[model samples]
Target: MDKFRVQGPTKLQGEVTISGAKNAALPILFAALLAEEPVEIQNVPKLKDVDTSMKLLSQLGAKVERXGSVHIDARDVNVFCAPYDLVKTMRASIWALGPLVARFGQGQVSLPGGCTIGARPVDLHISGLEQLGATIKLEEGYVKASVDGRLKGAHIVMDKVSVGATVTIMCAATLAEGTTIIENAAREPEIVDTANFLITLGAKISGQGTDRIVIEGVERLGGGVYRVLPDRIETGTFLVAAAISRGKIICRNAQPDTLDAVLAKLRDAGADIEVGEDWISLDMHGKRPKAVNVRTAPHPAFPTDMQAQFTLLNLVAEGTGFITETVFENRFMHVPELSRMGAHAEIESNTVICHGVEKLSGAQVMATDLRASASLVLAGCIAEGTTVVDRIYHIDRGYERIEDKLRALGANIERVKG
Candidate 1:
């Protein structure tokens, strides 16, 4: 087992570089299956989830190669099944289903069954693909989908906004027979990032980063080179890390404009921020942060992914604060773990009230999920003693060399492989 042993009461200062957006990179990597030629993706983060994606792609016969960049040649792809072994490791494994069905006309994908987070139902995705003229059915915990020929496009409306459904169905629509209009689509920046990459592959997709998206089906798509955006959730976590420790640091290779909601909250927590085209600098020296209430909604609003980290900021603040999570259930899994570290908090239905603690001492803790794991590390950085975080593999699923980045930023965090 691998765990992060972090010595607390250490202020982090220096420079850090963000990794490519895992949210954006996952779907775009899967979307490469629709291309007939080679697709080159740069800045793909070296994370466990990405490794799972590449393994699944390789099992499907795509020539996956990596040097300085990821070059995927899906032209020889023939396999059409994403097995349970791969799907159980990461929910994003289902992303391969859409392109497999789009380019191969049939696919068997295992139902994703991996998160401790709430029921992230694939119902919306199933319904949307059905509306696109693909016959789908559940068979022994696998989604079996097939079309007689190329998909016939139609008007698809989701019951609610979902990023996974929007991305999956949009990729399937790219190689469909006619025009497809998706209403109530997810307008997340990662969705826009994937859409732009699809466009580079000759996919006629418009209205991304909006609630309604229109896609014109084309006969075939080749390939192109596209770079992904930075991981905004990781950027937000580091911003919280700075404010909690009263440190100053600049994050290079990050786009501040994409983090409006998160940056605004960090500023509300009493961190001085400076922004430019490709960087964000945060300073929290000589400041006891003021508590700020946060509500997590969809993108362009506060994100649920950053909810746990934001809760940590409230923990070390001067006043009581509440964070409401509207996106997913069972997401406050970090509250108990933080409480074990001598922090004060209470959960009420969908929200958690963080009562400010004068000082948080450290204890042995465990990670529950991806974002939860990150929040624990952020909390550990400011705790009064040693904080040992177990189950750090969950952290490696999304964050790329997080301890290394934190170490470079002057945090006394190291991975102890046991």
Candidate 2:
């Protein structure tokens, strides 16, 4: 376990480059199991989850070499079981369930119980695979799937728009026996990026980033090279950091169009923002931030991942602001930690009402989840005195050298190995 000791009341300055998305890269790496050739992927971020994904691939017997860029040779993969030890560490391990059954005809993946956020929507993942003609059985704690001959494609519709199920079912559909059509699919940019990666490997996929997606099955895939997309959640977190600290920063290697919902909300909170082709710059002058209401939804709307960080924004803003967490239950677990920093907030069922104050004094806090930990770190930058954040391994699971990055931006933060 690690903790961060942060001295507050310092304005952040300088440009920070966003890394490759953890969410996008995880599914793409799992989908590479369908290809028999060496798959070369660039721009993969260095994170704990990425390491776990690569380790899971190797456990399936794929030779993975990681250095400057990740190189994977899945041709010699002979196993189809993801053990409980590795699968319990990350929820993305379920993404491997689809690829293994599609490529090897039989696979077993341990069910990853939901982490701190809430109970993950695994029903959709199971139901979607069943629609694709896989005989699914849940053993002790693993999902055992096997197909008769090969995966037979059929029309599958998601009961809910879930990015996890969409990517899982979409990856399996790429190597099915016939054409597979997915309706009510998730429209996230990560889904599109996964589809692009599969398409480059000679899988026939169309209508990604839309509600309806069509995938034509292929016999086997010959690997190719692809680059992972820049992390939109990381980029947005930096932008929110700029606004929360009343600082100026430019985020490079970011796609602004992928964050329209976040940018619009930031503008509503009284931050001056400018966007170019591949960059977004935010400048917050010496002014009090106005309270803005935010509601979380799927892609093209406020994302659930950014909810905790934006709660930090609303807590220090002027007047009263409300945050509605529509996507996940127990997401407001960060509020108790924020309250330790003298933040005034009232939590009801799904929405939290925060009353902005002049400033909050620093105190010790604990991180509950990945995004919640990010919000606690940002809270220290604006709070008075020294704020120590414990249980920071959750932060390392997503952000890349966050303390070094914040230190570069003039924030007094340090990582303490405890």
Candidate 3:
């Protein structure tokens, strides 16, 4: 096992560049299966989940290679089976089922299991595909799906807004026979990024960053090269890191438009934030940040993925604040880990009320999930004495060289293998 050891009370200065979006990259890589030609994707981050996604692509018989970017040739892919060994390692693996069944007319993907963030059912995915003419069966924790001939496009109205289902259906709809309309779609930036990548591959899609999306089916996709967007969540994490440490830091290669909600919240928390087209500079000025309550929702609202890190900021603020997690029931798994560091918090239903603590005394904490690991790291940077964060593999799945990035900004952090 590997853990992150941090020396506390360090002010992070200087700048760090944001990596490509992991959420965007996963679905885009899986979307390559719909193309008959080679797809070259740029700005791909080096992460554990990415390694698993590429491995799964190879398992499906695609000739994949990575050198500064990802290149996948799916022409030789005949295997439509995503085994539990690979699919269980990443929840995004289920996104491949739609493309596989669309292009190959059949697919067998294991039911997904990743971070213990409640039951994120793939029923929406199955229902949408079923409406698109795919006969799907769930048996023994695997999703078995088959379609007779090419899939005929039909109207798909999502009962609830789901980013995963939206991306999955968008990929499948790219190769359908007619137009497919997705109503009540999720408008996350990653969804728009996936739509853009598909367009480069000759996919006809419109209304990506809206509630309703229309995709006109195409016979075959011709792949070229596309660049993934800079990760907004990673950008938000770095911003919160600056606030947590009461330090000045700059984030480059960040898109301000994509993170408007997070920026507004940080500003309301009394952070001195300067935003530009491609960068954001923050300086807490050694002041006690004012607390602000947040309720996570779909995009254009507070993002649920950021709830954990934002809660860490609230723990050190002057007044009390509340975090309402509407997306996942179990996302507050970091509360106990934060309490281990002398922070005070209590859970009421899906909400957590945080009382500000003057200073946190560093203690060994365990990483709960992807965002929870980030919260612990933020706590470690501001706590007194030394802090050790265990089970950092969850962080490795999303962040690229996080310790290296933190080190460049003057944080005393290191990774040690145990």
lDDT of 2 by residue, 1-418 (tens): 7899999898887899989888888889999899989999889988888899999999899999887478999998898999999888887888889999898988999988767777675988888888888889989999999988788889987788899999988999988889999999999999999999999999999999989999999998988999999899999989988898888999999999899999999999999999999999998886667899999998999999999888889899999999998789678888999999999999998999989888988999998687667999988988899999999898888888889888888899988886
Q: Which digits, one per residue and each the tens of the lDDT, describe model 1 over residues 1-418?
A: 9999999888878888888998888898899999899999999888888888899999999999876478899988888999988888788888988998888899999988746778777888888889888999899999999999899888998898898999989999999999999998999999999999999999999999989899999999988999999989888888888888889989889988789999998888889999988999999876878899999988899999998888888888999999998998679889999999887999999999989887788889999787767989887888998999999989989798898888887888988878
Of the candidates shown, which would achieve the greatest lDDT relative to the real structure? 3
lDDT per model, in order?
0.89, 0.89, 0.90
Error of 2 at 137 (Å): 0.8
Error of 2 at 294 (Å): 0.6
Expressed as tens digits, the lDDT of each residue in 250-272 for candidate 3 is 89988899998999999999999
Query: How many clashing residue pairs, candidate 2?
Result: 0
**Runs in model 3 lying further than 4 Å from the true structure:** 113-115
Cα displacement (angstroms), candidate 2, residue 133, comes to 1.0
Given candidate 1, what's the lDDT at residue 343? 79
